[PDB]
């Protein structure tokens with residue numbers, strides 16, 4: 100909508116207070132004009148027609164329980180926007196400052212979040228398995244990364260390409276989490292998963308096998324479920340990324356870690372300059388090697404580390 104840029108305040112899903120960029124025009128809207136062509140958050144009002152209505156608030160204070168998922172959706176979209184711009188010189192998900200829209204309160208007890216080709220959608224969770232999914236900055240950035248992927252490599256959401264696609268989103272979801280620097284880890288969804296159980300999460304990049312996901316190519320899932328295991332076989336690429344960053348010895352193969360920032364630069368370049376819609380794991384390894392080569396030189400530690408990491412997860 101047209102109006103004047105303001106700053107509201109409220110509370111997120113985990114009860115933390117934050118300021119949010121809003122727009123004033125009779126009501127204060129969850130519309131952030133400070134980033135590209137706007138960040139827009141909507142109320143789906145427990146139904147599934149999207150996007151729903153642009154979030155409207157009478158006094159620019161967002162402390163109602165009902166407000167909390169909207170607050171975090173809008174805020175964490177801004178953080179994610181900030182990461183890609185500041186760290187990779189990318190302007191929103193299409194690279195040309197496309198408007199970022201999100202809808203919260205989608206359906207009833209909906210234990211998921213997703214990118215629907217045009218926008219972010221967040222369930223509220225059933226309160227058992229999940230609380231409103233926008234509470235997790237890694238979940239928000241995972242999903243927005245899918246948009247980035249869809250506009251760049253275009254990895255098909257099936258079999259190995261799909262698994263890479265999932266990994267990329269877990270990878271950048273995690274790097275945005277570190278970027279924001281609130282309790283960062285190499286786990287996924289821990290902030291909003293199983294409110295009754297502490298110390299768990301949806302997936303682990305540091306040890307995928309903690310939840311039955313493969314950490315080695317010889318352990319890959321080959322059935323047809325989950326689009327050919329896109330959230331399952333991602334663990335193999337997740338572990339590779341973890342090792343490039345953090346180092347370690349995995350099934351006997353030692354990797355020299357090179358840190359999160361170089362991890363991000365290598366995988367961002369692979370994503371935007373080398374991967375294609377039908378890339379497989381073996382082509383991801385080659386893309387990552389070439390990317391590290393472009394960035395640091397063929398005799399670099401960085402290249403050497405990439406080779407060890409894929410070696411360690413049995414990807415040649």
Ligand SMILES: [Ca+2]
Pocket residue numbers: 156157158159160161162
């Ligand atoms: Ca209010």
Ligand SMILES: [Ca+2]
Pocket residue numbers: 276281282283284289290
């Ligand atoms: Ca965390």
Ligand SMILES: [Ca+2]
Pocket residue numbers: 237273276283284285286287288289
């Ligand atoms: Ca996490």
Ligand SMILES: [Ca+2]
Pocket residue numbers: 289292293294295296297298299300
């Ligand atoms: Ca939990």
Ligand SMILES: [Xe]
Pocket residue numbers: 179180183191192243247
């Ligand atoms: Xe983005």
Ligand SMILES: [Zn+2]
Pocket residue numbers: 241242245265268
């Ligand atoms: Zn995903």
